[PDB]
Design an enzyme around this catalytic site. Structure first.
Site, PDB file in Angstrom:
ATOM      1  N   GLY F  30      13.764  -5.865 -42.492  1.00  0.00           N
ATOM      2  CA  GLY F  30      15.022  -6.559 -42.302  1.00  0.00           C
ATOM      3  C   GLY F  30      14.838  -7.951 -41.742  1.00  0.00           C
ATOM      4  O   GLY F  30      13.800  -8.593 -41.928  1.00  0.00           O
ATOM      5  N   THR F  31      15.865  -8.427 -41.045  1.00  0.00           N
ATOM      6  CA  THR F  31      15.856  -9.751 -40.440  1.00  0.00           C
ATOM      7  C   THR F  31      15.548  -9.638 -38.953  1.00  0.00           C
ATOM      8  O   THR F  31      16.070  -8.755 -38.265  1.00  0.00           O
ATOM      9  CB  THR F  31      17.199 -10.455 -40.649  1.00  0.00           C
ATOM     10  N   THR F  32      14.694 -10.534 -38.464  1.00  0.00           N
ATOM     11  CA  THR F  32      14.289 -10.506 -37.064  1.00  0.00           C
ATOM     12  C   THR F  32      15.467 -10.836 -36.156  1.00  0.00           C
ATOM     13  O   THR F  32      16.130 -11.863 -36.325  1.00  0.00           O
ATOM     14  CB  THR F  32      13.147 -11.494 -36.825  1.00  0.00           C
ATOM     15  N   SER F  33      15.725  -9.956 -35.189  1.00  0.00           N
ATOM     16  CA  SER F  33      16.773 -10.162 -34.195  1.00  0.00           C
ATOM     17  C   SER F  33      16.208  -9.808 -32.829  1.00  0.00           C
ATOM     18  O   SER F  33      15.795  -8.667 -32.606  1.00  0.00           O
ATOM     19  CB  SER F  33      18.009  -9.311 -34.506  1.00  0.00           C
ATOM     20  N   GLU F  47      20.115 -13.487 -37.094  1.00  0.00           N
ATOM     21  CA  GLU F  47      19.890 -14.426 -38.181  1.00  0.00           C
ATOM     22  C   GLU F  47      20.367 -13.805 -39.486  1.00  0.00           C
ATOM     23  O   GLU F  47      20.263 -12.593 -39.690  1.00  0.00           O
ATOM     24  CB  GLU F  47      18.404 -14.811 -38.287  1.00  0.00           C
TER      25      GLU F  47
END
Lengths: 217, 205, 243, 204, 85, 245, 245, 222, 250
Positions: F30-33, F47
């Site tokens: 996924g997207t880095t958070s 993001e």
């Protein structure tokens, strides 16, 4: 005083310290005193924990009656306590009786002392039937007939045992009855039937473990 | 309130002093004319430090209030003891559905190391509120206006006990539905204390 | 057909394959602990590993407070550890609702084991292979420790531990319990009893730790608490002054 | 008043020496209008009788419920049952539903088949427990029999003397009540056999 | 191997070694059942090497029980006898 | 076959079934958070990867803030992340119903772990394949707990997910030596854009968009705010100030 | 999982029939041999036992042969525990008949009702039936004596001489040629004892392995009498019939 | 209906009359109003005696099963919440005043039970219709540090005050002593305040004064 | 939503018996050795308690529980399988004639109702059977004492003297050798010690061997001095020291 062990261990040393009569009167007073638990072995007091100490007091009677020759009085003491052992747990009935003979057979006693009390267990075997205790005493009862040099009564007890051993095992008791049977036929000058007794005894010795005292003999 | 259960309330009150709160009640148990229990002590314990008055339904405060102790151990035992409003809000929920059957008012006065002795009073209508001190019951009708006049903010220990003892003495003598001996409790950081007063004490003041 | 890798049926060896994998590795967490009983109190000590600088040491614990008098010792997977913890805490309050006394050791240990034994009947629902040890101090009988096995085995334990070194500490404790002929520790002053259990723990490990590297707690009479960072560090320093 | 009292009739039961006397009437009807001259309240399964007093909905219809569990006891245990044992099923069945309970107090009288001790049982409509060594009755006219056997019954009476005591007390008790009358049948409970004797009384 | 059979080998190799009178195998004789001569022959090995590590002359009873863990049970994977646990 | 991929109701020799291991790869894709835990409050980061110009910025927000006092953010699969949001916000409404009080962070964490552990017991129930990062402000102080897809959660002073989870937390330890308790959390907001910028080197494909939803112990005191206007471009320009090229 | 391990053995198998019915015949083959015989003066019912030892105590003696009513008996062939569920279940339906018409029920009513109990498991519910075969014996005021035999498949046929268990076709062959329209109690027992000797592998026939309970017409009166013979009375039957072993 | 109790230092003693009165006429002259929860806990109640066993026998049997469940001792307060929630489920529609007393591992306890959901505690407790007659005597003679012999005469005279001042009491008195150290002591027919002598003229009906029509024998078995 | 699996247990194998039952006897052979005998003067229930750790106290473990005061019971194989039965038996017995009548049904038909549930666990979908076999003795009314063996199927076995567990074949023949018209209470204890103890090895003490007697009623077990309409709890269990005292008699 309060602790029954105080009047016990102190009276135990009075045997060699003074005489027999000094330690005998203490045990007679401890009979009706010092209740503990469970049922009443004395009848004036309950005996559970003191029953182990009461057995020691009975063992101290073996130092007096047996050494002096008073066993005729001790012969009647066992049936008196027999009715008492039928009240509390009966696990002590065989345990105490097993330790009585060991002190009883040391001094060169008389045959009539053990024979009469052994028949009391036989008379008591009718109401309460114990095949383990009666046959265990029958081994030592036939031993008395070996010293009595009467092999007819000793063989009749063994014949009743061997008849039941065909349908049973009794491996610890099967070697003992054959070990004593060899003593019967040896004094009669028999090298065949006496050898066959120890032959069957060695058969059960390879199945289970017999005690060292039995294997040695 | 239903049949067979003794009416709570009557003479009850609590006063918040400097740091703490002092609950108090008399000892009487009556259904219509009689005293069934003369040692009666009205208290509700949701916590060691946090206490509560016993009011409204007698069967509810000995059962539903213990049911709150059941729900309190699903939180406090996991983390820690919450504030007074957390435990007092359960009294509003359990009495909301039974309001058409079980009608019980509850006066909750707790102790805390921050909010101190803030009292939360729930009337018969089953609504939580916030008041520094409140008095309710059918036997305390005489002492309502007495505690709203000479009251002083944040009294001391003995002065608060005397303020409650002098008040409860009027409800015991001048009422037939309220009487007995005054049994108080001390809520503070020093610990929990219990006191009982004799009829020969509060009668002469 | 015949494999337990999905359904659960009796194997030809007379032992379930699910029971195997539950008993085989409980050490996947890679942690050790110990539990002993004093005279009037109970002392439990559990190792603690903090492999980060961002971890809050007060949050991570294998010992959860159940009742006021009751502690708990749990070793296994973290998500499945709280499954039995949240249930035991909910069942602990049910005892007062039904009775209004404090939860005895003979109940809470029996309820969680009987609930785990129902999982043997249910093939659809998964059981828990998590080590469950309920420690507390009874009023009448004093200290008691009952370790609940995932297969439903629970009995009296004078002492217990976790990890592969459980048998190593058992050897040192068996010799001390054989001569004294007592199951618990008759010595008072539980502050010195905590250091006594650490000595047997060092023999299995061989290293020291800090105040936040060891989870230690003491179950006292009518009270159960958790040692803070200052209370743990005080005992690790004071043990060096004696021996 | 009592909906089960519309029919009427009572069941008298006593306890003698090695004997038990129990009896009822033949009257059945609605209010003051009678219907059945052949109706019998006493029911028997095992060695112990069962009396029943009240509305036929709870008398004859529930009789299938008594023999429901009784025959299951007979088809399983294949033995007898003590009067104290069967009486608990009676009481427990009434307290299952407190709002809907059955209004027929049964009467239980029999002789023990093990120890040989006569015992009587049976309760009221609510299931209140009443067990004595003299007499246990039920119904609206049971208030009469409370004081009748006090001046009549004597401890340790013969079965023939006990037969005359329960018969004479029942015949006069039915004449005084509008809910009882129209013949009285008396059963003599012995260790094994039971003797039935019909009696004649005032008709109207 | 029964109790009578294992006792004869115990006093064989230990006859040449000086043994303290306070050390005895009765703890390891009763509990052990159905073993072979390899476990017996290593009693003189592991317990003997235990005295070498600490430079001990005789062999006490404690070293007999300490070596009992490695002696009998050879499984280092997971415990032993998981049936009844 | 092996049974661990099809059924989660059996036992793995490593304690974690292969089905649970597949959930880890779904979250890392996924997207880095990341997340921030300091003395002034708890700051999150999210993001949104732009696949095409058709996407509209400042619309999709993966951060789900329960009331004003508790924030939460997920990653990986969208439906599995929003499934917990409906249950987490429902228990918070049921909490204020009974106790009439705001729910603390530790009381909020146990409700999340109970759903994950219960879905792994039933073979017919599909477990959660996403990771949960939640925080906020309570009556005590700042607390940050991350719920792993396996269900294990405990105290965290920092959070990360997506690509370079353990690599993004390396910059968090650098602030520990600089600030022992974290001190000012406002500068950490600029540090958050720099930590996310660290993952932009290997992951650079198309244009990026950063959103920040935080909460403070001091400024908000339990309230909720959002980074916009000058504060939005100030943190973005700080991440590009170090490396311009 | 929940599918590949479910083969649906209750539906049509590729052989065109039910495996659960076919394989239950082997369980009946391992079950004890129970030979029912309906004579003119009563119904003869015999049964065997499983592993009769020296210390095996016979008091109730009813295992594969029970009694539903004074006029109606029942016999089962199969696992005893599987039958015990339906032994008292037919009595519950029988006691409900007493609650209904307050009289004695003919056997033909309860034959088909219990057939749908095991058949209902295959029909729906996903359960499995019992592999125990039933043998019904009763009385009637129209047909006189009634002797029926059921099977786990639900078939029911009238049989004056029936045999189940091991050597089913072997025992029925000897009883077919030796059958007679007129048989009394003593005539039917002597034919059953000679048949049971060849069913098992034991030596001749004894009273310990023989489970025998029959019914006659009256004892002191002329109707409604049945008694289960104790094993002590079974030994006397061998003396009366003239067959020792 | 008059039942009392006294809690002394070494235990609690309870007493109940054997006279049961249902309605205006006495239903039973001899009965037992003292029920049992556990061997160490005896219970008592007012009103219908069967209403108590419709509850106590359900809970008390569970408490006896709870004894081996905890494997230590039955508990007195374990019968409170079980009895309190039982009356709450049915809303206490059966009016009764129960009295539960026993010995738990903690000590001796004497508890009171009201009609709906309410339970109390006291050193001495008397409930039922004849409670007001017995309670007044308990208020007269009392003191601290009571013994067994002092508690018997106090509870015996309390029932005698209820027997003479209330028509719902009579017959004999059954005193049940429960000691902490030893087991419970149940003495039936401890007092005989009511003794009915024989009638003067014996009335014996001679045989043959009835009218017999038919005769038969009831069927039993064949 | 729970219990979505409706399918039954393993179907018929090409055997004629159930594979779930065949593998259930494996745990019995690998479990504890239990026995029982009816001497008409008493009923002695003896078994062995396996302790695999020196830190495990056997005082908490009781393999012989009490459902009713006159009925003893003992199991084999899996321990906790019997513990759940006790919780279920006491609840089913509560709904049984204990509530219906004034007395619980005799051992014959009381165990059959409990064992009927064990067979329901072998049939209904989603439940799984046990691996244990139960030896349940008891005292009836007319028939005096009783002894019954219970397989995981639940069929009642009216034996006289039987033994199960590890080495059951060798220990069963010894019980068949010693028999007569009527035995005694103490004789059954000594016969069990010469059988149970000598069959296994490694546990010589009484803490690891649980023995209980039936038919002995102590006056201190009643709890009340009132009218003794019934004798009392004939079930009695020996303490730790009383079991070792039985060993010294042989």
């Amino acid at each position: 005083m309060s602790l029954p062990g105080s009047k016990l261990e102190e009276a135990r040393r009075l045997v060699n310290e003074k005489q027999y009569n000094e330690a005998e009167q203490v045990y007679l007073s401890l009979l009706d005193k010092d209740s503990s638990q469970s049922s009443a072995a004395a009848g004036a007091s309950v005996d559970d924990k003191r029953r182990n100490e009461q057995e020691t007091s009975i063992l101290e009677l073996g130092q007096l009656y047996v050494t002096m020759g008073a066993k005729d009085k001790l012969r009647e003491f066992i049936p008196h306590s027999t009715e008492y052992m039928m009240q509390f747990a009966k696990s002590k009935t065989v345990k105490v009786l097993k330790t009585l003979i060991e002190k009883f057979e040391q001094v060169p006693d008389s045959l009539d002392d053990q024979i009469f009390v052994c028949e009391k267990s036989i008379e008591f075997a009718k109401r309460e039937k114990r095949v383990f205790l009666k046959h265990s005493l029958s081994i030592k009862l036939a031993t008395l007939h070996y010293q009595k040099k009467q092999y007819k009564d000793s063989l009749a007890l063994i014949n009743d045992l061997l008849r039941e051993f065909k349908k049973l095992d009794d491996k610890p008791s099967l070697v003992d009855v054959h070990l004593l049977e060899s003593k019967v036929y040896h004094k009669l000058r028999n090298l065949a039937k006496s050898k066959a007794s120890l032959t069957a005894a060695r058969t059960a010795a390879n199945s289970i473990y017999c005690p060292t005292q039995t294997v040695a003999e | 309130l239903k049949k067979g259960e003794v009416s709570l309330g009557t003479s009850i009150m609590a006063v918040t002093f400097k740091d703490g709160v002092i609950l108090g009640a008399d000892s009487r148990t009556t259904t219509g004319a009689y005293i069934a229990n003369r040692v009666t002590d009205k208290l509700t314990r949701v916590h060691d430090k946090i206490w509560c008055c016993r009011s409204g339904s007698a069967a509810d405060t000995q059962a539903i209030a213990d049911i709150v102790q059941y729900h309190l151990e699903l939180y406090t035992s996991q983390y820690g003891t919450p504030s007074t409003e957390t435990a007092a809000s359960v009294f509003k929920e359990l009495c909301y559905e039974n309001k058409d059957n079980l009608t019980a008012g509850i006066i909750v006065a707790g102790y805390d190391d921050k909010n101190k002795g803030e009292v939360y009073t729930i009337p018969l209508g089953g609504s939580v509120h916030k008041l520094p001190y409140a008095i309710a019951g059918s036997g305390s009708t005489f002492i309502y206006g007495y505690c709203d006049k000479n009251f002083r903010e944040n009294m001391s220990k003995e002065e608060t006990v005397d303020f409650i003892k002098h008040s409860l003495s009027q409800a015991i003598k001048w009422d037939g539905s309220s009487g007995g001996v005054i049994r108080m409790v001390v809520l503070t950081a020093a610990g929990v204390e219990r006191l009982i007063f004799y009829p020969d004490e509060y009668e002469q003041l | 057909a015949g494999y337990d890798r999905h359904i659960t049926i009796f194997s030809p060896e007379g032992r379930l394959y699910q029971v195997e994998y539950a008993f085989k590795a409980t050490n996947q967490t890679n942690i050790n602990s110990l539990a002993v009983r004093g005279k009037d109190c109970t002392v439990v000590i559990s190792q603690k590993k903090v492999p980060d600088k961002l971890l809050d040491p007060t949050t991570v614990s294998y010992i959860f407070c159940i009742s006021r008098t009751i502690g708990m010792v749990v070793n296994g997977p973290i998500p499945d550890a709280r499954n039995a913890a949240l249930r035991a805490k909910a069942e602990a309050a049910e005892f007062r609702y039904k009775y209004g006394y404090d939860m005895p050791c003979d109940v809470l240990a029996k309820r969680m084991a009987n609930l785990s034994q129902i999982y043997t009947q249910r093939a659809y629902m998964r059981p828990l292979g998590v080590i469950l040890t309920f420690v507390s101090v009874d009023e009448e009988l004093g200290p008691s420790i009952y370790k609940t096995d995932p297969a439903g085995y629970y009995v009296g334990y004078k002492a217990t531990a976790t990890g592969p070194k459980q048998q190593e500490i058992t050897t040192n404790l068996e010799n001390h319990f054989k001569k004294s002929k007592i199951d618990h520790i008759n010595e008072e002053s539980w502050e010195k009893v905590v250091e006594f259990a650490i000595t047997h723990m060092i023999d299995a490990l061989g290293t020291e730790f800090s105040k936040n590297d060891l989870e230690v707690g003491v179950a006292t009479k009518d009270k159960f608490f958790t040692l803070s960072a200052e209370n743990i560090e005080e005992r690790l320093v004071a043990i060096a002054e004696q021996d | 008043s009592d909906p089960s009292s519309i029919n009427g009739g009572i069941v008298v039961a006593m306890t003698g020496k090695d004997c038990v006397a129990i009896a009822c009437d033949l009257r059945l009807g609605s209010q003051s209008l009678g219907v059945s001259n052949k109706f019998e309240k006493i029911f028997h399964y095992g060695h112990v009788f069962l009396g029943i007093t009240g509305l036929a909905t709870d008398v004859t219809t529930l009789n299938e419920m008594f023999r429901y569990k009784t025959n299951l006891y007979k088809l399983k245990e294949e033995r007898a049952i003590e009067p104290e044992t069967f009486t608990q099923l009676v009481s427990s069945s009434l307290y299952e539903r407190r709002f809907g309970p059955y209004f027929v107090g049964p009467v239980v009288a029999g002789i023990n088949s093990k120890s040989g001790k006569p015992f009587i049982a049976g309760f009221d409509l609510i299931g209140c427990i009443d067990e004595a060594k003299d007499f246990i009755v039920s119904g609206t006219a049971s208030d009469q029999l409370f004081g009748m056997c006090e001046s009549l019954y004597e401890p340790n009476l013969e079965p023939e003397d006990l037969f005359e005591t329960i018969s004479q007390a029942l015949l006069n008790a039915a004449d005084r009540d509008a809910l009882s009358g129209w013949g009285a049948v008396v059963y003599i409970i012995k260790k094994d056999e039971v003797v039935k004797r019909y009696l004649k009384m005032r008709q109207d | 191997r029964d109790r009578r059979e294992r006792r004869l080998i115990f006093g064989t190799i230990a006859s040449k070694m000086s043994l303290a009178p306070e050390a005895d195998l009765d703890s390891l004789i009763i509990r052990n059942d159905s073993l072979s001569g390899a476990v017996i022959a290593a009693i003189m090995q592991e317990a003997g090497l235990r005295a070498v590590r600490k430079n001990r002359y005789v062999i006490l009873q404690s070293d007999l029980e300490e070596a009992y863990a490695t002696q009998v049970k050879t499984d280092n994977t997971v415990d032993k006898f998981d049936f009844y646990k | 076959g092996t049974g661990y991929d099809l059924s989660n109701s059996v036992f793995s020799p490593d304690g974690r079934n292969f089905q649970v291991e597949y959930a880890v790869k779904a979250v890392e894709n996924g997207t880095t958070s990341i997340g921030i835990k300091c003395n002034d409050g708890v700051v999150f980061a999210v993001e949104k990867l732009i696949t095409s110009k058709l996407l509209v910025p400042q619309k999709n927000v993966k951060i789900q803030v329960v009331d004003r006092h508790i924030g939460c953010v997920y990653s990986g699969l969208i439906p599995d992340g929003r499934h917990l949001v409906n249950r987490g916000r429902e228990e918070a409404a049921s909490f204020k119903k009974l106790y009439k009080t705001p729910i603390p962070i530790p009381a909020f964490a146990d409700r999340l772990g109970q759903y994950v552990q219960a879905h792994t017991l039933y073979n017919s129930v599909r477990p959660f394949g996403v990771s949960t990062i939640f925080g906020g402000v309570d009556k005590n102080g700042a607390h940050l707990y991350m719920l792993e897809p396996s269900g294990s959660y405990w105290g965290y002073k920092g959070a990360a997910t997506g690509k370079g989870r353990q690599s993004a937390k390396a910059e968090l330890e650098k602030l520990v030596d600089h600030h022992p308790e974290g001190l000012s959390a406002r500068e950490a907001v600029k540090q958050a854009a720099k930590i996310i910028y660290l993952a932009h080197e290997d992951n650079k494909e198309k244009d990026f968009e950063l959103e920040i939803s935080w909460c403070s112990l001091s400024e908000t005191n339990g309230l909720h705010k959002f980074v916009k206007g000058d504060l939005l471009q100030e943190a973005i320009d700080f991440a590009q100030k170090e490396i311009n090229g | 999982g929940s599918r590949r391990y479910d083969s649906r053995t209750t539906i049509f198998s590729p052989e065109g029939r039910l495996y659960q019915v076919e394989y239950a015949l082997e369980s009946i083959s391992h079950a004890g041999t129970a030979i029912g015989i309906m004579a003119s003066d009563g119904i003869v019912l015999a049964a065997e036992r499983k592993v009769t030892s020296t210390l095996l105590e016979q008091d109730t003696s009813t295992e594969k042969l029970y009694k539903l009513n004074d006029k109606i008996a029942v016999a089962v062939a199969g696992l005893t525990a599987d039958a015990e569920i339906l032994i008292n279940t037919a009595r519950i339906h029988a006691q409900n008949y007493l609650k209904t018409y307050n009289e004695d029920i003919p056997v033909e009513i309860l034959v088909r009702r219990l057939s749908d109990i095991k058949q209902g498991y295959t029909q729906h519910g996903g359960l499995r039936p019992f592999g125990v075969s039933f043998i019904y014996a009763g009385y009637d005021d129209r047909y006189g004596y009634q002797l029926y035999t059921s099977n786990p498949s639900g078939n029911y046929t009238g049989w004056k001489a029936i045999s189940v268990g091991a050597n089913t076709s072997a025992a029925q062959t000897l009883l077919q040629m030796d059958y007679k329209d007129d048989m009394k109690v003593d005539d039917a027992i002597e034919l059953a004892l000679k048949t049971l000797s060849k069913t098992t592998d034991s030596s001749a026939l004894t009273y310990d392995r023989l489970e025998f309970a029959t019914i006659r017409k009256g004892a002191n009166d002329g109707e409604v009498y049945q008694k289960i013979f104790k094993p002590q009375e079974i030994k006397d039957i061998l003396v009366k019939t003239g067959i020792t072993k | 209906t008059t039942i009392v109790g006294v809690k002394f230092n070494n235990g609690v003693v309870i007493a109940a009359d054997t006279r049961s009165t249902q309605g205006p006429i006495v239903a039973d002259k001899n009965c037992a109003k003292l029920h049992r929860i556990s061997p160490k806990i005896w219970c008592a109640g007012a009103g219908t005696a069967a209403d108590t066993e419709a509850v106590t026998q359900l809970i008390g049997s569970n408490i006896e099963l709870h004894s081996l469940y905890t494997s230590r001792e039955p508990r007195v307060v374990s019968a409170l919440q079980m009895l309190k929630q039982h009356l709450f489920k049915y809303q206490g529609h059966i009016g009764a005043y129960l009295i539960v007393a026993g010995v738990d591992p903690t000590g001796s306890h004497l508890f009171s039970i009201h009609a709906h959901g309410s339970t109390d505690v006291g050193y001495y407790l008397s409930l039922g219709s004849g409670s007001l007659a017995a309670m007044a005597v308990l208020e007269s003679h009392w003191k601290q540090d009571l013994t067994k012999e002092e508690a018997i005469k106090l509870a015996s005279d309390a029932i005698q005050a209820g027997i003479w001042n209330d028509l719902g009491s009579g017959s004999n008195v059954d005193v049940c002593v429960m000691e902490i150290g030893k087991d419970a002591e149940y003495l039936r027919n401890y007092l005989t305040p009511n003794v009915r002598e024989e009638k003067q003229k014996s009335y014996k009906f001679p045989r043959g004064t009835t009218a017999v029509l038919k005769e038969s024998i009831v069927n039993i078995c064949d | 939503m729970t219990d979505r699996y409706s399918f039954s247990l393993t179907t018929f194998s090409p055997s004629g018996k159930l594979g779930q039952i065949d593998y259930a006897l494996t745990a019995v052979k690998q479990g504890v050795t239990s026995l029982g005998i009816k001497a008409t003067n008493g009923v002695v229930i003896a078994t062995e308690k396996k302790s695999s750790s020196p830190l495990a106290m056997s005082e908490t473990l009781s393999k012989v529980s009490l459902l009713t005061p006159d009925i003893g019971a003992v199991y084999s194989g899996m321990g906790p399988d019997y513990r759940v039965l006790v919780d279920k038996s006491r609840k089913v017995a509560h709904t049984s004639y204990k509530r219906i009548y004034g007395e619980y049904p005799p051992t014959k038909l009381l165990v059959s109702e409990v064992a009927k549930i064990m067979q329901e666990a072998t049939q209904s979908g989603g439940v799984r059977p046990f691996g244990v076999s139960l030896l349940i003795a008891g005292h009836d009314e007319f028939n005096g004492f009783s002894l019954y063996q219970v397989d995981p199927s639940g069929s009642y076995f009216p034996w006289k003297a039987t033994a199960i567990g590890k080495g059951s074949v060798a220990a069963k023949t010894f019980l068949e050798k010693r028999w007569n018209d009527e035995l005694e209470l103490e004789d059954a204890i000594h016969i069990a010690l010469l059988t149970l103890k000598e069959s296994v090895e490694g546990e010589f003490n009484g803490d690891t061997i649980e023995l209980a007697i039936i038919g002995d009623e102590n006056p201190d077990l009643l709890g009340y001095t009132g009218i003794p309409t019934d004798k009392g709890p004939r079930f009695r269990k020996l303490t730790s020291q009383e079991i070792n005292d039985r060993l010294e008699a042989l």
